Amino acid sequence: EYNVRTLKWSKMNLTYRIVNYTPDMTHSEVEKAFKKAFKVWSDVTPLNFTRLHDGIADIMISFGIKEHGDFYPFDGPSGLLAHAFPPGPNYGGDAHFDDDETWTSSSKGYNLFLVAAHEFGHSLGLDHSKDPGALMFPIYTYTGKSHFMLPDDDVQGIQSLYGPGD
Amino acid sequence: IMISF
Ligand SMILES: [Ca+2]
Ligand SMILES: [Ca+2]
Ligand SMILES: [Ca+2]
Ligand SMILES: [Zn+2]
Ligand SMILES: [Zn+2]
């Protein structure tokens, strides 16, 4: 397919844009899930994320079905859930979510917040973790917790790129 | 990349 890589962004302040919304969730729920997903990474780095409402941002977020632009098509219900590109121009940093999945803010289907937090990891330069319990593990696992703690494997990875936070 | 099942 169409691919972009660099190890990391050369700046600490990044922009994102929610291009379109899944019908499974409300605009407010989708916006909250993505905002928390960026918070996972800005809590432990100097990274900052600013949301844009039009134009082109560093991280363009969109929901698509099957072939959607990059010739890495989705596969319908289940299987591939999402993917994202490493840092760089154009597609670099972008996050794609398969809208053939039922996206929820809870546990009914696939948790948008969890998947997005993982993909934004990739958008920042992270690879997959060899640890099945790390966020960046490629297999989707639902936690069932009323909160999310970013595992240490994921903190060390993102801090090796951008350094620590507060 | 996230995968289920
Ligand atoms: Ca799929
Ligand atoms: Ca981009
Ligand atoms: Ca859907
Ligand atoms: Zn894609
Ligand atoms: Zn992944």
PDB file of C-alpha atoms and ligand atoms in Angstrom:
ATOM      1  CA  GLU A   1       0.000   0.000   0.000  1.00  0.00           C
ATOM      2  CA  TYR A   2       0.754   3.727   0.213  1.00  0.00           C
ATOM      3  CA  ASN A   3       3.180   4.319   3.064  1.00  0.00           C
ATOM      4  CA  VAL A   4       5.198   7.224   4.397  1.00  0.00           C
ATOM      5  CA  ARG A   5       9.636   7.114   8.083  1.00  0.00           C
ATOM      6  CA  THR A   6      11.194   9.225  10.837  1.00  0.00           C
ATOM      7  CA  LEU A   7      11.734   8.005  14.379  1.00  0.00           C
ATOM      8  CA  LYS A   8       9.700  10.794  15.974  1.00  0.00           C
ATOM      9  CA  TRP A   9       8.197  14.229  15.532  1.00  0.00           C
ATOM     10  CA  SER A  10      10.753  17.041  15.610  1.00  0.00           C
ATOM     11  CA  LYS A  11       8.283  19.226  17.540  1.00  0.00           C
ATOM     12  CA  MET A  12       6.448  18.771  20.843  1.00  0.00           C
ATOM     13  CA  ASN A  13       3.198  20.547  19.882  1.00  0.00           C
ATOM     14  CA  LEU A  14       1.019  18.569  17.468  1.00  0.00           C
ATOM     15  CA  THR A  15      -2.370  19.217  15.885  1.00  0.00           C
ATOM     16  CA  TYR A  16      -5.160  16.758  15.161  1.00  0.00           C
ATOM     17  CA  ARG A  17      -8.526  16.870  13.418  1.00  0.00           C
ATOM     18  CA  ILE A  18     -11.556  14.579  13.663  1.00  0.00           C
ATOM     19  CA  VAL A  19     -12.506  14.429   9.977  1.00  0.00           C
ATOM     20  CA  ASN A  20     -15.706  12.399  10.357  1.00  0.00           C
ATOM     21  CA  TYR A  21     -17.716  10.654  13.058  1.00  0.00           C
ATOM     22  CA  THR A  22     -18.942   7.098  13.490  1.00  0.00           C
ATOM     23  CA  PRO A  23     -22.744   6.762  13.752  1.00  0.00           C
ATOM     24  CA  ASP A  24     -22.340   4.286  16.631  1.00  0.00           C
ATOM     25  CA  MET A  25     -21.466   7.171  18.973  1.00  0.00           C
ATOM     26  CA  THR A  26     -22.359  10.815  19.435  1.00  0.00           C
ATOM     27  CA  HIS A  27     -20.046  13.628  18.362  1.00  0.00           C
ATOM     28  CA  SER A  28     -19.427  14.410  22.041  1.00  0.00           C
ATOM     29  CA  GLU A  29     -18.598  10.785  22.884  1.00  0.00           C
ATOM     30  CA  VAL A  30     -16.241  10.478  19.901  1.00  0.00           C
ATOM     31  CA  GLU A  31     -14.550  13.765  20.839  1.00  0.00           C
ATOM     32  CA  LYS A  32     -14.130  12.661  24.458  1.00  0.00           C
ATOM     33  CA  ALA A  33     -12.642   9.280  23.508  1.00  0.00           C
ATOM     34  CA  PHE A  34     -10.022  10.873  21.259  1.00  0.00           C
ATOM     35  CA  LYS A  35      -9.226  13.619  23.791  1.00  0.00           C
ATOM     36  CA  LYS A  36      -8.569  11.073  26.550  1.00  0.00           C
ATOM     37  CA  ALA A  37      -6.488   9.006  24.116  1.00  0.00           C
ATOM     38  CA  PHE A  38      -4.122  11.926  23.525  1.00  0.00           C
ATOM     39  CA  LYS A  39      -4.150  12.612  27.273  1.00  0.00           C
ATOM     40  CA  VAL A  40      -2.663   9.148  27.851  1.00  0.00           C
ATOM     41  CA  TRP A  41       0.498  10.295  26.060  1.00  0.00           C
ATOM     42  CA  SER A  42       0.668  13.969  27.106  1.00  0.00           C
ATOM     43  CA  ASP A  43       0.399  12.933  30.766  1.00  0.00           C
ATOM     44  CA  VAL A  44       3.858  11.303  30.622  1.00  0.00           C
ATOM     45  CA  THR A  45       5.654  13.440  27.992  1.00  0.00           C
ATOM     46  CA  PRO A  46       6.055  17.135  27.118  1.00  0.00           C
ATOM     47  CA  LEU A  47       3.772  16.503  24.116  1.00  0.00           C
ATOM     48  CA  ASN A  48       0.784  18.786  23.595  1.00  0.00           C
ATOM     49  CA  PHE A  49      -2.147  18.176  21.261  1.00  0.00           C
ATOM     50  CA  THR A  50      -4.386  20.909  19.851  1.00  0.00           C
ATOM     51  CA  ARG A  51      -7.625  20.052  18.064  1.00  0.00           C
ATOM     52  CA  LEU A  52      -8.427  21.728  14.751  1.00  0.00           C
ATOM     53  CA  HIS A  53     -11.929  22.002  13.322  1.00  0.00           C
ATOM     54  CA  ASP A  54     -11.004  22.517   9.658  1.00  0.00           C
ATOM     55  CA  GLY A  55      -7.979  22.351   7.415  1.00  0.00           C
ATOM     56  CA  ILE A  56      -5.056  19.955   7.581  1.00  0.00           C
ATOM     57  CA  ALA A  57      -3.587  18.862  10.926  1.00  0.00           C
ATOM     58  CA  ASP A  58      -0.598  16.692  11.795  1.00  0.00           C
ATOM     59  CA  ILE A  59      -2.871  13.811  12.835  1.00  0.00           C
ATOM     60  CA  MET A  60      -5.937  13.425  10.624  1.00  0.00           C
ATOM     61  CA  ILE A  61      -8.463  11.037  12.217  1.00  0.00           C
ATOM     62  CA  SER A  62     -11.167   9.414  10.093  1.00  0.00           C
ATOM     63  CA  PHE A  63     -13.534   6.440  10.075  1.00  0.00           C
ATOM     64  CA  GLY A  64     -13.561   4.399   6.869  1.00  0.00           C
ATOM     65  CA  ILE A  65     -14.770   1.083   5.485  1.00  0.00           C
ATOM     66  CA  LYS A  66     -12.791  -1.328   3.240  1.00  0.00           C
ATOM     67  CA  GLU A  67     -10.732   0.697   0.723  1.00  0.00           C
ATOM     68  CA  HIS A  68     -10.465   4.230   2.092  1.00  0.00           C
ATOM     69  CA  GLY A  69      -7.534   5.947   0.377  1.00  0.00           C
ATOM     70  CA  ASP A  70      -4.215   4.350   1.291  1.00  0.00           C
ATOM     71  CA  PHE A  71      -4.664   0.899  -0.308  1.00  0.00           C
ATOM     72  CA  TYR A  72      -4.461  -0.731   3.117  1.00  0.00           C
ATOM     73  CA  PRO A  73      -8.179  -1.594   3.106  1.00  0.00           C
ATOM     74  CA  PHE A  74     -10.209  -2.676   6.099  1.00  0.00           C
ATOM     75  CA  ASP A  75     -11.860  -6.090   6.200  1.00  0.00           C
ATOM     76  CA  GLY A  76     -15.382  -5.579   7.545  1.00  0.00           C
ATOM     77  CA  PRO A  77     -16.537  -6.631  11.009  1.00  0.00           C
ATOM     78  CA  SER A  78     -13.796  -7.655  13.460  1.00  0.00           C
ATOM     79  CA  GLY A  79     -10.271  -8.609  12.402  1.00  0.00           C
ATOM     80  CA  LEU A  80      -8.408  -5.390  11.582  1.00  0.00           C
ATOM     81  CA  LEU A  81      -9.822  -2.670  13.826  1.00  0.00           C
ATOM     82  CA  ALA A  82      -7.692   0.378  13.018  1.00  0.00           C
ATOM     83  CA  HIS A  83      -4.221   1.474  11.988  1.00  0.00           C
ATOM     84  CA  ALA A  84      -2.048   4.567  11.943  1.00  0.00           C
ATOM     85  CA  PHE A  85       1.064   5.871  10.252  1.00  0.00           C
ATOM     86  CA  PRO A  86       4.463   6.798  11.738  1.00  0.00           C
ATOM     87  CA  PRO A  87       5.547  10.461  11.914  1.00  0.00           C
ATOM     88  CA  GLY A  88       5.864  12.330   8.631  1.00  0.00           C
ATOM     89  CA  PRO A  89       3.962  14.491   6.142  1.00  0.00           C
ATOM     90  CA  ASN A  90       0.574  13.753   4.577  1.00  0.00           C
ATOM     91  CA  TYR A  91      -0.534  10.307   5.781  1.00  0.00           C
ATOM     92  CA  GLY A  92       2.224  10.314   8.415  1.00  0.00           C
ATOM     93  CA  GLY A  93       0.607  10.449  11.847  1.00  0.00           C
ATOM     94  CA  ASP A  94      -2.911   9.806  10.523  1.00  0.00           C
ATOM     95  CA  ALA A  95      -5.246   7.378  12.320  1.00  0.00           C
ATOM     96  CA  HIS A  96      -7.875   5.287  10.504  1.00  0.00           C
ATOM     97  CA  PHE A  97     -10.656   3.398  12.293  1.00  0.00           C
ATOM     98  CA  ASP A  98     -12.732   0.687  10.624  1.00  0.00           C
ATOM     99  CA  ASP A  99     -16.351   1.840  10.727  1.00  0.00           C
ATOM    100  CA  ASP A 100     -17.609  -1.675  10.046  1.00  0.00           C
ATOM    101  CA  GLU A 101     -16.941  -2.181  13.773  1.00  0.00           C
ATOM    102  CA  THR A 102     -19.398  -1.140  16.447  1.00  0.00           C
ATOM    103  CA  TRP A 103     -17.525   1.586  18.336  1.00  0.00           C
ATOM    104  CA  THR A 104     -18.618   2.281  21.912  1.00  0.00           C
ATOM    105  CA  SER A 105     -17.555   4.386  24.862  1.00  0.00           C
ATOM    106  CA  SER A 106     -18.101   1.342  27.111  1.00  0.00           C
ATOM    107  CA  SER A 107     -17.884  -2.414  26.488  1.00  0.00           C
ATOM    108  CA  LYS A 108     -20.748  -3.137  24.060  1.00  0.00           C
ATOM    109  CA  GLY A 109     -18.413  -3.388  21.061  1.00  0.00           C
ATOM    110  CA  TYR A 110     -14.853  -2.130  20.595  1.00  0.00           C
ATOM    111  CA  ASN A 111     -13.717   0.626  22.935  1.00  0.00           C
ATOM    112  CA  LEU A 112     -12.783   3.602  20.758  1.00  0.00           C
ATOM    113  CA  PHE A 113     -10.662   5.147  23.526  1.00  0.00           C
ATOM    114  CA  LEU A 114      -8.450   2.061  23.938  1.00  0.00           C
ATOM    115  CA  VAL A 115      -7.864   1.541  20.212  1.00  0.00           C
ATOM    116  CA  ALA A 116      -7.179   5.232  19.620  1.00  0.00           C
ATOM    117  CA  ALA A 117      -4.683   5.443  22.496  1.00  0.00           C
ATOM    118  CA  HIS A 118      -2.817   2.538  20.900  1.00  0.00           C
ATOM    119  CA  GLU A 119      -2.860   3.986  17.371  1.00  0.00           C
ATOM    120  CA  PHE A 120      -1.804   7.461  18.537  1.00  0.00           C
ATOM    121  CA  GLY A 121       1.155   5.617  20.021  1.00  0.00           C
ATOM    122  CA  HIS A 122       2.077   4.709  16.426  1.00  0.00           C
ATOM    123  CA  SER A 123       1.309   8.255  15.250  1.00  0.00           C
ATOM    124  CA  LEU A 124       4.043   9.399  17.661  1.00  0.00           C
ATOM    125  CA  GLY A 125       6.689   6.887  16.554  1.00  0.00           C
ATOM    126  CA  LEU A 126       6.054   3.802  18.740  1.00  0.00           C
ATOM    127  CA  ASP A 127       6.291   0.218  17.522  1.00  0.00           C
ATOM    128  CA  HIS A 128       4.328  -2.739  18.867  1.00  0.00           C
ATOM    129  CA  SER A 129       5.256  -4.106  22.289  1.00  0.00           C
ATOM    130  CA  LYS A 130       6.553  -7.608  22.886  1.00  0.00           C
ATOM    131  CA  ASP A 131       4.500  -7.502  26.121  1.00  0.00           C
ATOM    132  CA  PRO A 132       0.904  -8.796  25.782  1.00  0.00           C
ATOM    133  CA  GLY A 133      -0.060  -6.487  28.649  1.00  0.00           C
ATOM    134  CA  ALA A 134       1.270  -3.283  27.109  1.00  0.00           C
ATOM    135  CA  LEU A 135      -1.063  -0.849  25.381  1.00  0.00           C
ATOM    136  CA  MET A 136       1.049  -1.113  22.231  1.00  0.00           C
ATOM    137  CA  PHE A 137       0.460  -4.878  21.921  1.00  0.00           C
ATOM    138  CA  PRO A 138      -1.234  -5.432  18.526  1.00  0.00           C
ATOM    139  CA  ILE A 139      -4.026  -7.730  19.820  1.00  0.00           C
ATOM    140  CA  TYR A 140      -7.092  -5.926  21.164  1.00  0.00           C
ATOM    141  CA  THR A 141      -7.816  -6.815  24.802  1.00  0.00           C
ATOM    142  CA  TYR A 142     -10.628  -5.273  26.824  1.00  0.00           C
ATOM    143  CA  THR A 143      -9.730  -4.348  30.399  1.00  0.00           C
ATOM    144  CA  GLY A 144     -13.092  -3.826  32.090  1.00  0.00           C
ATOM    145  CA  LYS A 145     -11.672  -1.157  34.397  1.00  0.00           C
ATOM    146  CA  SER A 146     -13.287   2.166  35.319  1.00  0.00           C
ATOM    147  CA  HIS A 147      -9.931   3.830  34.591  1.00  0.00           C
ATOM    148  CA  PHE A 148      -6.847   3.342  32.475  1.00  0.00           C
ATOM    149  CA  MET A 149      -3.260   3.079  33.700  1.00  0.00           C
ATOM    150  CA  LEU A 150      -0.621   3.353  30.996  1.00  0.00           C
ATOM    151  CA  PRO A 151       1.711   0.349  31.460  1.00  0.00           C
ATOM    152  CA  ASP A 152       5.378   0.934  32.191  1.00  0.00           C
ATOM    153  CA  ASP A 153       6.545  -0.643  28.924  1.00  0.00           C
ATOM    154  CA  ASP A 154       4.568   2.022  27.063  1.00  0.00           C
ATOM    155  CA  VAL A 155       5.835   4.881  29.254  1.00  0.00           C
ATOM    156  CA  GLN A 156       9.477   3.904  28.716  1.00  0.00           C
ATOM    157  CA  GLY A 157       8.929   3.674  24.969  1.00  0.00           C
ATOM    158  CA  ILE A 158       7.342   7.085  24.591  1.00  0.00           C
ATOM    159  CA  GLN A 159       9.804   8.672  27.032  1.00  0.00           C
ATOM    160  CA  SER A 160      12.740   7.285  25.053  1.00  0.00           C
ATOM    161  CA  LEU A 161      11.472   9.484  22.199  1.00  0.00           C
ATOM    162  CA  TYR A 162      10.228  12.673  23.881  1.00  0.00           C
ATOM    163  CA  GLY A 163      11.384  12.509  27.505  1.00  0.00           C
ATOM    164  CA  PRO A 164       9.283  12.659  30.668  1.00  0.00           C
ATOM    165  CA  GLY A 165       6.441  14.953  31.652  1.00  0.00           C
ATOM    166  CA  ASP A 166       5.393  16.805  34.810  1.00  0.00           C
TER     167      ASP A 166
ATOM    168  CA  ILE B   1      -2.445  -1.726  14.175  1.00  0.00           C
ATOM    169  CA  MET B   2      -5.161  -3.343  16.296  1.00  0.00           C
ATOM    170  CA  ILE B   3      -6.524  -6.841  15.607  1.00  0.00           C
ATOM    171  CA  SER B   4      -9.330  -8.849  17.254  1.00  0.00           C
ATOM    172  CA  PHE B   5     -10.182 -12.568  17.380  1.00  0.00           C
TER     173      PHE B   5
HETATM  174 CA    CA C   1     -12.406  -4.888  10.559  1.00  0.00          CA
HETATM  175 CA    CA C   2      -0.569  13.527   8.792  1.00  0.00          CA
HETATM  176 CA    CA C   3     -19.952   1.162  12.910  1.00  0.00          CA
HETATM  177 ZN    ZN C   4      -5.976   3.401   6.313  1.00  0.00          ZN
HETATM  178 ZN    ZN C   5      -0.670  -1.316  16.337  1.00  0.00          ZN
END
